Amino acid sequence: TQQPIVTGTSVISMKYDNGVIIAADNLGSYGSLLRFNGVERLIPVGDNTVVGISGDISDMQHIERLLKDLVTENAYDNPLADAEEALEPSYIFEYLATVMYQRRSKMNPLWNAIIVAGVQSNGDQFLRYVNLLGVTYSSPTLATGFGAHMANPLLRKVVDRESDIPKTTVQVAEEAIVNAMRVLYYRDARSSRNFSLAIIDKNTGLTFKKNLQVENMKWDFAKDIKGYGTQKI
Amino acid sequence: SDPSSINGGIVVAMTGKDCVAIACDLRLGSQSLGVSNKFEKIFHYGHVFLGITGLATDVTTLNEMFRYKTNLYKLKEERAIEPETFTQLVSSSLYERRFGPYFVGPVVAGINSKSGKPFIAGFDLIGCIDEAKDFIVSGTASDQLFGMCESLYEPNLEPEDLFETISQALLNAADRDALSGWGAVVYIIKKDEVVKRYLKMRQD
Amino acid sequence: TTTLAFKFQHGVIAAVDSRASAGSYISALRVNKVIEINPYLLGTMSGCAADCQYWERLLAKECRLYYLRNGERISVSAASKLLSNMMCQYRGMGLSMGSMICGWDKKGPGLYYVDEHGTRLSGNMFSTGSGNTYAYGVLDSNYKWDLSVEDALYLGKRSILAAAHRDAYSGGSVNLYHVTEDGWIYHGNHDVGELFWKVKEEEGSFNNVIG
Amino acid sequence: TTIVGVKFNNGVVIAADTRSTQGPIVADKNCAKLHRISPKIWCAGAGTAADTEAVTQLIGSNIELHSLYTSREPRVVSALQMLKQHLFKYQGHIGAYLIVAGVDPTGSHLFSIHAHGSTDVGYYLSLGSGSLAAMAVLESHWKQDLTKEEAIKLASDAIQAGIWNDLGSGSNVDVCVMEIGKDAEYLRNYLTPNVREEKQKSYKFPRGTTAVLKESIVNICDIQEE
Amino acid sequence: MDIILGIRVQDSVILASSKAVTRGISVLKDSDDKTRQLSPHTLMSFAGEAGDTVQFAEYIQANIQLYSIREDYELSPQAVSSFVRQELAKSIRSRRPYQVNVLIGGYDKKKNKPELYQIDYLGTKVELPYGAHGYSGFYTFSLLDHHYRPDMTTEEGLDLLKLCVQELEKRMPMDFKGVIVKIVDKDGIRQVDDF
Amino acid sequence: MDIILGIRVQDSVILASSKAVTRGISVLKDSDDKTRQLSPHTLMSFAGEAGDTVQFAEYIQANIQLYSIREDYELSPQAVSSFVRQELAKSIRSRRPYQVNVLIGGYDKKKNKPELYQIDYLGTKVELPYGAHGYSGFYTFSLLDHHYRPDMTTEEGLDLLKLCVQELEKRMPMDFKGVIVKIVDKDGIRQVDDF
Amino acid sequence: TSIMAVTFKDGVILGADSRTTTGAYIANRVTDKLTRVHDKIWCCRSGSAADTQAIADIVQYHLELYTSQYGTPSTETAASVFKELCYENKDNLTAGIIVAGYDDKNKGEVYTIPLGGSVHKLPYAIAGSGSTFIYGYCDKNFRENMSKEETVDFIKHSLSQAIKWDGSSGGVIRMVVLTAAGVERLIFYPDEYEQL
Amino acid sequence: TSIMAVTFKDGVILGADSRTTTGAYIANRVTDKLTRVHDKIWCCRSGSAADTQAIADIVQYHLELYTSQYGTPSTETAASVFKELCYENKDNLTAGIIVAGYDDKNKGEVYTIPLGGSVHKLPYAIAGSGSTFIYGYCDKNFRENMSKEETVDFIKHSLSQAIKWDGSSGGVIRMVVLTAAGVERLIFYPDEYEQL
């Protein structure tokens, strides 16, 4: 049993017609202190999977190393390591899910919430969640922390059920994700303007976008707001 | 320890076509011990009926209080109180003890003597009104009653059909609650006749 | 729960209720609180359902192995002790199990009370569970060694009924057993709802209750 | 509970869902959370339901008497000040969280109020368990110089977000529009997207199914003459 | 204190109350009478926290005696029981509640009927053919459920009561030092000196 | 369990032990024998937490019986008491201690003397002319201090023991359901069937 | 919260962020923490919003009644009323208030009233959860008798850093200028102050 | 405690105060918080002195053994050993360590390891109870590729302010310069840095 120290906030994601999108800001918070401003919380595994992690950063860095070691180990005595016997999103997820549930069962959890986004061999979209309790679930949209409360409602307006996935393009999905990240910046006190976004498409592969910023923000209306009730000036 | 579950008991009310029904079990207990099988939880002030679940001392106390208040209402107003008005009186009376409440779950049932409109309502222990069209439930088997009422109930039932529906909702909910049962009573209420029926049920 | 068991002239009677609870919620109307360890051994159950089932079925495994090694059926005294020894291993670990081991062996009819503390008591009459006090009232005032099989079965049946009525966490149905030197004999499942009204009329008891 | 308030060109609109809960159980599927303080000052409450009602009726009563005393129409700042001073006095023990909106001779107003007595000002607000889902919609779609029609749409869309995504919120959408120089229009069940489907079977019983012991006539009439 | 029992038969009410009083680990008295006559045809037994029981009983006694003198009239057992209940219901929400449980046995001279009322410290009143407080009912109610008839004589009521005390004496861990039995009927209140 | 008494007279040791066994609010048994014969001339009574008492007593019994067979010789009461003390002193610092208090009554055939040892669950041993555990001594030691002589007969020891039980039965709140009395002398161990 | 009040040559300026949080949720991102108790006596509020609003409302009432009887009150007098409330009700309050005002006689004055209800007259003051991160910056960069433009830059840069590091602080930077000329409100948006 | 490590053109400089407290008592006013784990790999310690000393001693042992087998270790390697100890024993440790070292290949590098056992490579780092008060100052005044004299002034001014506001910080300012030229120790006394 521990407590989280340096933490990362929401990770948000969604399925679209040809793949999945995942995003997460670049902040490492130390309680209310916005301590670290260059933290990458999306970690690619090969060219078909991106693992997005929220929660304790020290445990994230540990998981980051487990995945790096997983790729190394898979290549051992494996002539098809970059082809048929390459790591799949489902393999990577189940490994992490096994680790998370074992650690919680020893009362020494990895204090994280993880979303594994990727595209399988057969072109199928993969999107599944796992956390410190070993709880797992899948949905057309997935989000951790504050993202669950504020991002999912917005992303579910685009893909409300399974049948909406083929009707959703990458431009629409990316737009929804970017808007959600802005909303989180408005309303999450442990979020940052800077974020990373990753798209895993079954045709165009893995596109990893760094140093993205929240833009087109509305603040002008603040000038008119005065006092807390009766004050006019 | 929990005052709302020491004595046990349940109350349910339903609306029908130009009629209402209110029913209650007869048990009074001290936790696991059954004490009385004749503890009726439904009272009436004129043509307005009130069922009360929860802590038995507060049930008794509130009945005596609303009898007191409705008797004065009648002397001054020169008419019997109506269900809508009584509902507000119950709500007012409970909220005046906001920080030292009566541990009860009251349920009002009756027909407006002027409009003829059937009326039921429920409250929490602190006065919040639940004016439902269909049914109201209260007691230690409220979850059980919600499940039974929600599946068995249909609108515009006739008095003799409504009787069967409310009776079966109560009986089967009580038979899945340790703290409810030991007999049951059902009131069938029409604009100018009221029938009261004691049900036969398992005594464990 | 309410369970009882008593020795008498023609063996031992065992009677249990059939309710199960999860707080105020009645989780089961008809659970089997007697285990048929062997044709001449019974075990009653009260407390944690899981504990009762696991440990008494493990006792049956261990009683069966006794027969294979020795070519002879285990005594009631030895069976009760194996069970009490199991309880002593998980001493203070939070088990909840109250049971009577009823049977017939070479010393005649046998009855032992065993609980999670490792207690092991020999006696002519026992009753366990939340409603044991109600059962004891009827048993103590009506019990004799000279009871007939018919009157004895009724006493155990009527004693559970008494508990089912008053105890909120006892009821459902009554399961009767009669243990003889040719083995135990099941005497049926008796719904308390129907039994209550039947007993009320025939016996004249429960006058206060209206029916 | 999900409640919102949205300002627009010539007034203000509030909205709310219609689910009331006791724990995980739904007590009332069509509860009315939009309360009236005065004719053109309406309130919506989250938190302890009895407290939101009682505190609304009390202040509404005093506001009416104040209006009669001063021969003037009640102001939203009066209701606000009276509410916060009452709530502050009870130090949060009266669990009333409200969005207060209305029109008066000064103009259109929109305030939020928290149980401890703090107040806020805004062009768009949300309260309750579904506030975050609703605010996500408001932050995405709200703009300056909204029309009446755009504001009702935004308000109800924000409530729907709460209905679908928050388990504490559900059923229908209530709305009240307060426009300057007009009567306030209360739109009870403005939206009804959660109608229960027809049941597969009727559970109406045969007459005589239930066993009965005694029947008796209940005397509800008074004592008779002669 | 510990055990108080009550039974209403054909023409009387019988109250049985334990004699023991304990402080610390020592039984100070084995002849204590846990009862007060409220009026000539109304008797109240009591059990609960030390000191509170007698203080409450005497306070009730004084109030009923005051009523009797003022009106030159005996209140019905029902009226007395309602007065007592209200005092307990008033008490439970006080700064320091009176932790007292009572049985009220009375003979109504108007209706010519015996009446037994059970009231606990919360103000929970019930009219019963037989009653008890605390753990007493756990042992005795099964016997009473079995043997009780409403047409029983006073002598049959005492015999059924003996059976209840014998069961208590067998299965209760505590020694309550026997009981004092009192009968309430049309002729008033009398004590059974041999039990 | 509740009460265990012991008294050493001229030529014997007498142990008296209560018969009651209680679970919850119900007395399950009123004829329980809270004792084990460790050897032909050594008897141990016991009282403490449920289950632990019998398990401990039987474990001691097995060890002494094992010694008797191995050496074809009966250990002295002093030797047995020391063995028991060490087991309890070992137990008190264990993960889960055995919560058992004992009296060991034995007749030493070598010295031709009766011996009574009192040992509590901590491993606190004392040789005494008379002893008790728990609250039993609070009521009885004043009588024993007054009436006890070392030259008392077995019959006088029983009469003084009756007086102790009568005092317990009067002033203890708990009903311990009488006692089983056993006498340990040169001829061995026997039970007094009428007490 | 990040709040500050700074005296300069022509008077005094109050500055504040606009973020209000309930845990990690931002309940209001455009809060006005600069509150007026008199024409040219304003305060910055920190701590319990309920407590600080209730206090400032009572103070505004006292100073309005003071004015009706005795004329325009001093900034010191305003701070004393705040103090008296904060000190005597310290067991039931969680309020950290900075008082700032302009007289023609006394010119710009700043008083800070921390949790206990003590009063401290200062050239400038900082308070709120975000103030901790700018103690070093403000101490190094503050000068007496700065110009209006210099003082606005000082507050802007300071609160910029407080907002940057404190999660409980953020939104817009509001400022109120108190001089003989009158009362000027200022606002500075993220795109302006973040790039400093 | 107030500790910091800053990279510059020619390498890296570690800086620290010298105060150690037991509550409000100053147990040592001339502490050396700049500790050597290898020739040109040093660390700044914050948190439990017992924990941080025990860790740095173990790290020094590991790097001495590393050197005997594999040659001079990198600063990254040193930080990894610190991390591994801090992370795996996080339940029983209270250690906040800044690691700083000079290679000829990698030049000056700075790693910070806060409470949880995470590692963060930075241009400069600050830590300890006194660091909170200089987040704003250090952010505004830090530049990359400063000169030695500029970097010494930056650390001196920064820790000066941390000491000024933090009661747990104080005494002398110790510094260690890590370059190709070698290892230079510096010290700055109160009379020098207080008047800045």
Added chain:
Amino acid sequence: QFNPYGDNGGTILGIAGEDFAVLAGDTRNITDYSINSRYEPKVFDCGDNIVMSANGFAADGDALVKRFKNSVKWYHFDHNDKKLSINSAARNIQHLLYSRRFFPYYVYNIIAGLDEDGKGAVYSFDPVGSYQREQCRAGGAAASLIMPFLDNQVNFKNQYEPGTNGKVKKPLKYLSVEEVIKLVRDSFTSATERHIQVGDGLEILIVTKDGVRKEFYELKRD
């Protein structure tokens, strides 16, 4: 302090017919007041004509099912591809649950299938392994809402035959699969209305001698 347990909501329902059995469950997965998934399968085909659902804490439920599926696999290996009977599966699951008596699987488990005489069978468990064969059982969040309804509509409790007035009970006529599915759908529709953790979707697994069949029905998404 770390809490190793959680509540993912949901509700499950098993009914045994004369020659068939059903195991139903909603597809909603939740934490607190949020929805994780509107479609997260909860009832599984475990092989050998057995269906299972472990409802409560999803992590423990998935682990149990995963372990039992594994137990079935090894039963085939060790015992010459013998079919695991429903009674044997039930006993096996008891031991899986009690292996964690002191750190329980936080789930209410139900299995359904056919007994060795071809009749419909449902077995019910508690979190620590007590089990028994039942005709009717609802488990999970809205179990208390649904069970009484089933006592009334499946076992005809408190139902008597008109005219006799409580003297003669309603006879226990068997139910068809079409009739059972109606009671299942009405049970979940009713539970969805009054329970906030129940909704989104309903998945029913029907077991007959022919095999395992699936039926899906939408539920209210509020």
